[PDB]
């Protein structure tokens, strides 16, 4: 009954969220051959070795100075005091020549990742964004294509094929020898994943009536949350990415074995002013949600606890949104939730160096504020719009959010090379501008 739908909804989350755990770009530094023998001969410490050799740029600039440059010093020659060998050769180390990492890099982690496996750092750092770009392109292409298959064959036949293709693609990607095969498998997996999720949700909506639509939507949200919580536990005992990929892919194959028209909304001056605002708000919130998730995943100092806390705090938002239905209007919660997601960004920009106690609270507040705003849009959509919803919604809204999601990773990851806080200003501006447009929704000349 509901168990299969809950399992499918839970298993959909890892496909979209596993970028945080699969590639986590641990700390790295340049490798110089011949230093191991000298270090082991007059051994002093295994953690302070880089303080005397590896270049460092504490104040700033460490991206391309301490992680992509090495000292071209003949360490083989036995002329050193094993305390300050560079000082003995010359009192000024600033004028020493530099160079590229001709051999490779050594990383600091007990597990492994894609970045560690393929040495995907330094001048190749832009290559990690392709991982999400290909998935989002597959999401865009699948939405316009899976509709044809359902009409060609049927709703029942397509689900088994999509599930089988997804299950095979997961294992094949787990057994990928080079980078290009990984990208192809990611594209195929994203396409089929969106297709089967769409088909399953449409079938579920067909089976369930509109009397308990709110209840089933809340159940789906909680199923997504609980599926996302259990992913943190699996990654704790399986540090290697191949094992984690196999464990995530296995259970899917395990349980496997005078009419309302779209042209009427753009001729009446009253209805034409509402749909545009609805699309604008949906696109804005869809962009900010993924932006903040990726930003938190790319700079967290404690990944597991922060992920768990955010997932837990995401739950009461749905309850609050359901409670506040019959007491007040619909623009006050929207405006308050949209304003709560900007001031959090402004504060996060200006947080002085402190502990992590404030950061978790502020991130949870922002996540709850974003979560509240999305539910209200869905409730209003269901309340005010005619019988034809499903197809036009899941097509137009998906194609609108996918084009933003294709470009979001490039902006998020490539705007931190000049300043670390630039995407935060963009998020703040988007949040503050999204709150000032909802005030035009009320109709004028309305007297009780």
């Amino acid at each position: 009954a509901f168990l299969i739908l809950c399992l499918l909804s839970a298993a959909f989350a890892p496909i979209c969220v596993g970028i945080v755990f699969l590639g986590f770009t641990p700390d790295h530094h340049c490798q110089s051959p011949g230093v191991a023998e000298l270090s082991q001969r007059c051994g002093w410490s295994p953690a302070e070795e880089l303080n005397y050799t590896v270049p460092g740029l504490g104040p700033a600039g460490e991206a391309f100075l301490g992680q992509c440059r090495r000292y071209e010093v003949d360490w083989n020659q036995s002329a050193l005091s094993c305390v300050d060998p560079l000082a003995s050769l010359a009192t000024n180390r600033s004028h020493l020549p530099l160079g590229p990492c001709q051999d490779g890099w050594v990383y600091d982690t007990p597990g492994s990742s894609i970045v560690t496996e393929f040495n995907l750092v330094c001048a190749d750092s832009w290559k990690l964004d392709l991982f999400q770009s290909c998935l989002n392109a597959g999401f865009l292409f699948g939405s316009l294509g899976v509709g044809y298959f359902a009409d060609r064959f049927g709703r029942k036949l397509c689900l088994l094929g999509t599930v089988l293709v997804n299950a095979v693609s997961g294992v094949l990607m787990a057994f990928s020898p080079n980078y290009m095969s990984m990208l192809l498998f990611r594209l195929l997996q994203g396409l089929v994943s969106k297709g089967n999720w769409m088909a399953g949700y449409t079938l579920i909506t067909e089976f369930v009536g509109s009397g308990s639509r709110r209840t089933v939507a809340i159940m789906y949200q909680m199923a997504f949350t609980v599926g996302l919580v259990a992913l943190t536990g699996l990654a704790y005992a399986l540090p290697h990415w191949r094992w984690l990929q196999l464990a995530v892919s296995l259970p899917t194959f395990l349980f496997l074995l005078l009419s309302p028209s779209f042209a009427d909304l753009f001729r009446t001056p009253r209805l034409r002013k509402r749909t545009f605002i609805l699309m604008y708000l949906w696109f804005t919130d869809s962009v900010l949600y993924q932006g903040l998730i990726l930003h938190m995943g790319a700079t967290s100092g404690n990944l597991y606890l922060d992920f768990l806390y955010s997932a837990l705090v995401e739950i009461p938002g749905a309850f609050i949104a359901l409670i506040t239905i019959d007491r007040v209007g619909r623009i006050y919660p929207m405006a308050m939730s949209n304003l709560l997601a900007g001031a959090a960004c402004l504060v996060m920009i200006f947080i002085s160096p402190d502990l992590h106690w404030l950061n978790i609270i502020i991130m949870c507040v922002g996540r709850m504020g974003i979560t509240i705003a999305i539910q209200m849009i869905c409730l209003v959509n269901a309340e005010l719009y005619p019988t034809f919803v499903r197809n036009l919604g899941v097509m137009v809204c998906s194609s609108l959010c996918d084009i933003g999601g294709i470009i979001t990773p490039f902006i998020v990851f490539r705007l931190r090379e000049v300043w670390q806080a630039l995407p935060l200003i963009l998020f703040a501006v988007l949040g503050l501008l999204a709150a000032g447009v909802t005030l035009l929704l009320p109709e004028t000349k309305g007297v009780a």
Partner: nanobody
Amino acid sequence: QLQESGGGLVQAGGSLRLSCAASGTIFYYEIMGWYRQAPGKEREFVATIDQGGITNYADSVKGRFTISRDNAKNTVYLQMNSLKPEDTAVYYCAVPDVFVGRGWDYLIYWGQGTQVTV
């Protein structure tokens, strides 16, 4: 163009039906409802209905009024039975405003109603 019909004069108790008619654009894109005037008093609330089908009722009339929505004749119906002598007023078919106020207190349309007595 909201137009109401129905409403006679029952001797003492009974059942009767009220009907409201829309144009075709109001029917398919927003929320309808029924209000009461209660002459000698202020405006009152009796019921609503929306596209999905979720309905709300007033506290004083819960369990006595039934509202149903048609789809072929572009009309909305109201069913009431087991009346009381205090239930006499004119009934307005109105379109509330959802985004402002509380959700059912601000109006933008009405149809002048019709009178029924008990």
